[PDB]
Amino acid sequence: QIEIEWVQPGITVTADLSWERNPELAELLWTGLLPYNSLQNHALVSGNHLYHLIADPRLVYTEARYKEDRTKSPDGTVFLSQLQHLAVKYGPLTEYLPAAPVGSVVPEDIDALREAGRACWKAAWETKQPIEVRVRRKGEAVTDFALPRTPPVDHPGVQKLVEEIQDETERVWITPPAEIVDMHQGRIASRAGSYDQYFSTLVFLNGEVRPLGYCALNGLLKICRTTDLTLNDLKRITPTFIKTPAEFLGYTGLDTLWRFTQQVLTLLPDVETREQYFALVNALALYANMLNTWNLHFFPWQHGTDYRY
Amino acid sequence: QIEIEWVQPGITVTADLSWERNPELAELLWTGLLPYNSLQNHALVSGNHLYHLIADPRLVYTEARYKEDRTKSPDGTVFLSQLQHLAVKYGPLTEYLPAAPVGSVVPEDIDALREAGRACWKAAWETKQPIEVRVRRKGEAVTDFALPRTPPVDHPGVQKLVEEIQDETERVWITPPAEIVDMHQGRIASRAGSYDQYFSTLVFLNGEVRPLGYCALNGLLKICRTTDLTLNDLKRITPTFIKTPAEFLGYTGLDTLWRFTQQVLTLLPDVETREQYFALVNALALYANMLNTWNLHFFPWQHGTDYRY
Numbered sequence: 001q002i003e004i005e006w007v008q009p010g011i012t013v014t015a016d017l018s019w020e021r022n023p024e025l026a027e028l029l030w031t032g033l034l035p036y037n038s039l040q041n042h043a044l045v046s047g048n049h050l051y052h053l054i055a056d057p058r059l060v061y062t063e064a065r066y067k068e069d070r071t072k073s074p075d076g077t078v079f080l081s082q083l084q085h086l087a088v089k090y091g092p093l094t095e096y097l098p099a100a101p102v103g104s105v106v107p108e109d110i111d112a113l114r115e116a117g118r119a120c121w122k123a124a125w126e127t128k129q130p131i132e133v134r135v136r137r138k139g140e141a142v143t144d145f146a147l148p149r150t151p152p153v154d155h156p157g158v159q160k161l162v163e164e165i166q167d168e169t170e171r172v173w174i175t176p177p178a179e180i181v182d183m184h185q186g187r188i189a190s191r192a193g194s195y196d197q198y199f200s201t202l203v204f205l206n207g208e209v210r211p212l213g214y215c216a217l218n219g220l221l222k223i224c225r226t227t228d229l230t231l232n233d234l235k236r237i238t239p240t241f242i243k244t245p246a247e248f249l250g251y252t253g254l255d256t257l258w259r260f261t262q263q264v265l266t267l268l269p270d271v272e273t274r275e276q277y278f279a280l281v282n283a284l285a286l287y288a289n290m291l292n293t294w295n296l297h298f299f300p301w302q303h304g305t306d307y308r309y
Numbered sequence: 310q311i312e313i314e315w316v317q318p319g320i321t322v323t324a325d326l327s328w329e330r331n332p333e334l335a336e337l338l339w340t341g342l343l344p345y346n347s348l349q350n351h352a353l354v355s356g357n358h359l360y361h362l363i364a365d366p367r368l369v370y371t372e373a374r375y376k377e378d379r380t381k382s383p384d385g386t387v388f389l390s391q392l393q394h395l396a397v398k399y400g401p402l403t404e405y406l407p408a409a410p411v412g413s414v415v416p417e418d419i420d421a422l423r424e425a426g427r428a429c430w431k432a433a434w435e436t437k438q439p440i441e442v443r444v445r446r447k448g449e450a451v452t453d454f455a456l457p458r459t460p461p462v463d464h465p466g467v468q469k470l471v472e473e474i475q476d477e478t479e480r481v482w483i484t485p486p487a488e489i490v491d492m493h494q495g496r497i498a499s500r501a502g503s504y505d506q507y508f509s510t511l512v513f514l515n516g517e518v519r520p521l522g523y524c525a526l527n528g529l530l531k532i533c534r535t536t537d538l539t540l541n542d543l544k545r546i547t548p549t550f551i552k553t554p555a556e557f558l559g560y561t562g563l564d565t566l567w568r569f570t571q572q573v574l575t576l577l578p579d580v581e582t583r584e585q586y587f588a589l590v591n592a593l594a595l596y597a598n599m600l601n602t603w604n605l606h607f608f609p610w611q612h613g614t615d616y617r618y
């Protein structure tokens with residue numbers, strides 16, 4: 001049993017964990033991930049779905065034993081995905097992609113859940129109020145949320161950079177990053193956007209950050225942990241999947257993203273172990289995925305009033 | 310000397326190619342790429358910048374000898390890009406990323422160039438009328454534009470799928486794909502989009518397709534051609550970068566993309582040679598990059614009127 005606290009709406013629900021179908025994932029949440037906090041997003045495509053990022057690389061490569069069509073899942077079902085989400089269905093879904101269930105919100109708490117889901121939708125559609133979520137073991141108080149830090153690494157250069165990136169990831173974990181807020185308000189040093197408007201810039205912002213985190217960066221992580229591709233080859237293929245997106249994004253306004261990427265690309269040829277490679281890339285990957293949660297939050301979805309079925 | 314003809318606005322300019330700075334590039338265009346047609350897009354972020362797609366894998370990995378800041382290039386400058394573009398500056402740019410020049414539209418055609426530039430803008434911004442560009446060696450008239458096909462490959466199953474995919478890419482080269490048009494009109498069988506709107510779906514359609522093409526797929530082509538990564542490893546790493554994006558887009562409405570990806574992923578472990586790997590990923594790659602051009606064309610950029618600096 002776990003509790004899920006949405007702070008701003010002031011709603012807490014309780015969910016039963018199950019080791020029956022996906023024991024490795026249940027065990028991962030129960031033992032390795034809890035307790036944590038995150039920025040709570042609402043799905044913009046999939047339907048009445050809530051997901052939030054968990055700052056732990058294991059979610060990228062841990063396999064499920066059992067997946068089901070998520071639209072057929074009962075409301076209240078809790079999932080874990082390799083996009084590093086914990087997810088909860090609270091109403092109908094259109095996205096029929098397989099998902100890995102690990103439990104469900106107790107029957108007594110479903111109304112609370114749907115109510116909370118609507119509060120989360122309202123925040124992303126209208127108010128832009130960042131909604132903090134706290135997840136912890138049932139009946140275990142926490143007054144200490146801090147992002148995990150990968151074990152230190154025998155390399156002053158790598159470790160220093162890892163710490164810097166992770167620190168920054170924590171700093172803006174539930175606090176809006178200024179470089180994201182600024183772009184949405186048009187405060188953009190480079191004036192990016194054709195013909196004096198920055199709407200397109202926001203679409204490209206929203207568009208490039210997301211795959212860079214979950215696809216390129218997390219892909220490298222997945223490959224690194226689940227295959228025996230050599231360190232030399234990991235090092236070689238990395239600039240190819242991560243340089244251009246970050247560079248273009250740097251111009252649009254993500255100076256910190258692009259700065260971090262340059263320092264990583266700069267250190268990368270000289271790392272000596274797979275452990276060093278992984279901490280370096282993991283730190284950037286989490287930073288990238290963190291930014292996506294804020295784009296999900298801040299992007300003007302409101303325009304969809306003019307795009308109803 | 311080449312000729313760039315924009316069909317709809319009835320404008321044809323002449324450009325001098327130069328071997329002074331990027332000989333390998335100028336050569337490739339001159340001997341390898343001409344003549345061709347394409348869909349003319351206009352940059353939505355970079356400024357007064359025209360770019361279109363060229364159906365040749367060599368642009369992905371052929372290296373520039375020289376690059377300069379594009380904001381400082383004279384109006385009229387022609388560039389080739391590893392994004393598979395021929396690009397022309399016709400006014401101020403804000404994107405200061407380096408680009409490889411290969412020539413210039415002649416001085417007496419600059420006015421005609423800026424007319425072509427503004428007309429392409431009108432098509433992206435307001436009209437959504439597809440503009441066809443035709444590019445030729447000066448002198449030699451051209452009647453048939455067919456997409457380049459990779460040389461037949463000693464593997465019938467691979468070769469068949471390669472043919473089917475290339476055929477399809479050719480079919481909707483300058484004629485809009487129904488799957489893209491239908492989505493932008495809300496004709497989406499899965500009703501993807503939270504709370505009965507499909508605007509968010511259009512943002513994600515736009516955002517996911519582009520990196521899948523230029524970053525994941527094209528990245529694998531470049532890795533295959535510019536490094537000696539083993540075939541065994543090329544096959545191992547491929548699904549990690551291309552499955553998840555394609556599956557989600559399939560759900561959102563791109564049935565053909567997801568079907569072509571699944572087929573590629575089924576044949577991929579059976580591939581026997583690098584040449585077989587290359588042709589298979591290359592065909593899927595171009596198709597993906599082809600879809601990007603239509604997203605760039607059809608996405609409702611006009612919303613930018615509420616986002617002026």
Ligand SMILES: N[C@@H](Cc1c[nH]c2ccccc12)C(=O)O
Binds near residue numbers: 095553
């Ligand atoms: N369903 C998420 C987005 C999403 C789900 N799976 C994906 C895979 C790739 C990219 C985006 C996604 C939303 O609507 O907010």
Ligand SMILES: N[C@@H](Cc1c[nH]c2ccccc12)C(=O)O
Binds near residue numbers: 204244245352
């Ligand atoms: N210039 C393109 C966008 C672009 C340029 N370079 C990129 C690299 C990655 C992604 C997008 C881009 C436009 O504004 O239309």
